[PDB]
Write a protein that binds this DNA or RNA. Structure first.
Lengths: 317, 21, 291
DNA sequence: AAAAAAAAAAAAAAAAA
């Protein structure tokens, strides 16, 4: 009925959180996804320690993690999620042992182990996507202190190393910076900062975000952009005639690929990352356009020139 | 508060929303 | 009395395309050169199969291409080129067998085969030069979707592996990136994205580009720059009576707030002069001037 | 001189703050 990824995520969440897992709330789904990502990375208390190449401080931290008691049945997670008595069985069964590599399992040839490893990888990817979307959503109302200049903002979202490894094309941070500054191999993926990520309640159901869906402004914006992206993206929403909290998606932005404004260095000149910015002009900057694909057709919506976070804050006033 | 507006969807980045103009 | 480098290409083009091979149109020369490059790389239909270490899908594709019927005489290639029945004979004789290496030819000692391989190398070099110029000409009006950031704009032109092997100096692409990532050595060459390539109507006749030569603005720009270079290079071309897509060259650049103050050196009939940069790419400048 | 604009983003099976 559903692809492997969503089926495995649903099975894992249902097994670990029982009947307390709300399937229509973004916050609950995000909390469950984050907890599952922590469990599957061998990060919950009472799991195998990471000591392969650990510095003494890391050795001490991992030993303390190992010694501590694991989460007990009925522990409260998030806001309305309660672990069931049978989460330990799921953790012991469906979580690959620390250091497991697909090559070793394939060499062994156990079909069940290969299936479990594939499920674990799919769950890692799905939870990474959900957590990236949640980071975007949080960035719409709460600015991150780390981002203070466009250079820093270029690497949002900031997530752990395993988060970058699972979905290199969406996750930024320290590891994305290191990969970009380092040698770019055959597997290098450029950070697609503004990729479309359907809401968590649609991500686990497979309903791709498209026109006609009834969603909120904040959820849609976190799906198609983040806090500091331009405000014109708010045009992708239209309040309904009822309560108005949940509206309708009318059109989605189009990833611009029309023209390139670079100027490569030649004959002693110097490169220009953007012709408009370095021109010290303002007339063009205030009359830019964004290509929104609507039901009727493409439309050029003039940019508002103010952050999405500030636009939302002003509107809420 | 931070007034940056990162570039996206072909739009031009802004290092400060207020200073523009 | 032309050099063998160009004589071989002229003879090959004639023997392949009959009299339909116009020698005064850049598009015609470029299409003929591309076809000959494919022919000498065994990339056409009904030619040898590159199966030295090919993977399963590549092996199947090579086998299918080998089984696929070869082109027949009179085929229309490009827009104004038609094959001649003699081409097969030419493709039977001048094209070296797949996998042949200069080591084996030299070891054999056959003078005829050695000269054939030297001619093949020269033809490949000429065809790759033509292809690079054609890539620049195309880029000057329509920009590649691959090039989005300065990192990607550093490797233009993007050509196949054979093109890089023939002329590593001018060709970029994926294989140039791989070589750069590998190491730097005596055989390694540094990409020169703005080398002066005479237009194909000038290259096949040894007509070095020089001041006072009638050339279209796009022709000159492609021959001394590409789409994303600085717009100031447009100062090297001056139009004629009613322009009419024809003009003259007035100078050739050297070394083939303050950021916008950078100046380029242009050599004229009198002496070196410094011209202030425009700040807008040649592509955008031409697009805006068009309308 | 030597050696989803007949043929270029999103998701999947390969590789792996």
């Amino acid at each position: 009925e559903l692809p492997r990824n969503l089926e495995v995520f649903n099975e894992a969440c249902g097994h670990v959180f029982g009947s307390s897992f709300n399937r229509e709330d973004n916050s609950v789904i995000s909390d469950a996804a984050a907890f599952l990502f922590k469990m599957h990375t061998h990060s919950l208390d009472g799991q195998e320690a990471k000591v392969l190449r650990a510095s003494e401080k890391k050795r001490e931290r991992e030993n303390a993690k190992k010694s501590r008691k694991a989460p007990e049945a009925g522990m409260r997670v998030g806001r309305s999620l309660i672990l069931t008595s049978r989460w330990t069985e799921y953790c012991a069964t469906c979580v690959p042992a620390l250091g497991s590599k697909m090559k070793v399992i394939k060499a062994s040839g156990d079909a069940a182990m290969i299936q479990m490893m594939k499920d674990h990888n799919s769950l890692l990817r799905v939870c990474v996507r959900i957590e990236v979307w949640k980071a975007r959503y949080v960035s719409l109302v709460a600015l991150d202190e780390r981002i203070q200049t466009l250079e820093d903002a270029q690497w949002f979202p900031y997530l752990s190393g395993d988060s970058y490894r699972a979905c290199p094309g969406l996750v930024g941070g320290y590891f994305a910076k290191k990969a970009a500054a380092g040698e770019r191999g055959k597997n290098y993926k450029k950070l697609n900062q503004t990729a479309i990520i359907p809401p968590p309640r649609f991500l686990i159901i497979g309903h791709r975000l498209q026109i006609g869906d009834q969603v909120t402004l904040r959820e849609l914006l976190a799906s198609i952009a983040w806090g500091l992206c331009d405000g014109v993206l708010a045009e992708c929403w239209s309040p309904s005639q009822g309560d108005g909290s949940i509206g309708v998606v009318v059109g989605l932005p189009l990833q611009a690929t029309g023209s390139c404004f670079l100027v490569v260095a030649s004959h002693g000149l110097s490169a220009i990352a953007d012709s408009r910015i370095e021109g010290t002009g303002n007339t063009n900057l205030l009359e830019e356009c964004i290509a929104i694909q609507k039901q009727d057709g493409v439309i050029k919506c003039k940019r508002s020139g103010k952050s999405l976070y500030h636009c939302l804050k002003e509107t809420a006033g | 508060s931070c007034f940056l507006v990162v570039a996206s969807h072909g739009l031009s980045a802004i290092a400060d929303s207020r200073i523009e103009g």
